């Protein structure tokens, strides 16, 4: 029996969902339950994006599966340059300021080659031209080395059809496209599998065929990128058990629990709930709201999305670990410091993150004369050891691995009471305080009270240590183990 965690891809910078999938894989591995990540989109770099985090046997990508390239690792290097020069007798001309070569048979321009690296060891693509210098085809190479896909062009370099190959060069898939709103859209997919041909109209139907090929009685699927994975599981039989995993708030308007439309990315899953064995959410609080909303039609279970040097060697250092985005309302932390510096002149606030609001934050900093007090700082382990308190002033939240980590480092926190995440990781007067949303006066008062009472900060710090230890690896392993056991027994 195999547990499959179905996402979309891995990027160069891992998203929240991708991290959650990899963290879950690692727990299942420690546990001794077989698990694999399952990826859906064609991504000829996937093997490189994955290398830092999972091995090749830890994942199955859909395109790899049908291209007979699952579990394949990197080919020994190949010097395309020498082969073109010495064995094909072509003429190479380097393109200034790049990794690209133009390729010629004497006076005739044949190809434009692009390498990933300055050393020309990783061929990326090769464009082909006809006698009129029309670009008729593009060859896309997998980072492992093999030619993965050829794309046939028409008119102004528009995508008409694509052919996907195994490492030996055999065609395994074909995709035909038509343009809508200026972009190519799949209209047909042919797959060569099991010595037959199979036909589909879109990638959702291809995905559903792929799930069906993977499944054996005893296996369990987890739907993690539901915008794509729910329409796929909807086209598969109910004999295949699948758990839906929510990674964010489930409705567009958190303040209308009963009537708000579901998030567009979850609509397909919620509109077909009886397909799913359960739903997993990261917080007890979101669990209660979703159960109510779906009238308990399937089980909802909260399982955190992750688990938890010298400590508290204490200037008064406040910290904020938060994207610089409007929902985070980081300007309020500036306003808090503006008010607190009069009473606390050795105060500092360090804001770790990035985003479109940095400009305005710097302007307010300069406006208030706080340049030696408030820092936009852009691994946070050394940053925690002297942190007095964390601040959260957001108007909406999710379960925060960042907050988990600062709590493991003994750093207490004062947060607005907003859904979801703060109530999960903060117990008032134990490891921090929860403040009525947008009540900046209560925020000031509570922040000042912890600054004026270091013995209170210390108790809160010791409670932060204690709170983090409830999220240990071994407690997560036990939650996951019990959940899978139970889910398979009921199915």
Numbering used by the authors: 0 to 307, 312 to 317, 321 to 384, 388 to 500
Question: Can you provide the manuscript's text about this entry?
Answer:
Two glycosyltransferases (GTases), SdgB and SdgA, are responsible for the glycosylation of S. aureus SDR proteins such as ClfA and ClfB. SdgB first appends N-acetyl­glucosamine (GlcNAc) moieties onto serine residues (O-glycosylation) within the SDR domain using uridine diphos­phate N-acetylglucosamine (UDP-GlcNAc) as a donor substrate. The subsequent addition of GlcNAc to the glycoproteins is catalyzed by the second enzyme, SdgA, yielding glycosylated SDR proteins in which each SD repeat is decorated with GlcNAc disaccharide moieties. The glycosylation of SDR proteins mediated by SdgA and SdgB protects SDR proteins from degradation by host proteases, thereby circumventing innate immune attack.
Despite the biological significance of these two glycosyltransferases involved in pathogenicity and avoidance of the host innate immune response, their structures and the molecular basis of their activity have not been investigated. This study reports the crystal structures of SdgB and SdgA from S. aureus as well as multiple structures of SdgB in complex with its substrates (for example UDP, N-acetylglucosamine or SDR peptides), products (glycosylated SDR peptides) or phosphate ions. In addition to the dimerization role, the inserted domain was found to serve as a binding platform for the SD repeats before and after glycosylation. Altogether, the extensive snapshots of SdgB complexes in multiple states provided a mechanistic insight into how SdgB recognizes and glycosylates the clustered serine residues in the SDR proteins.
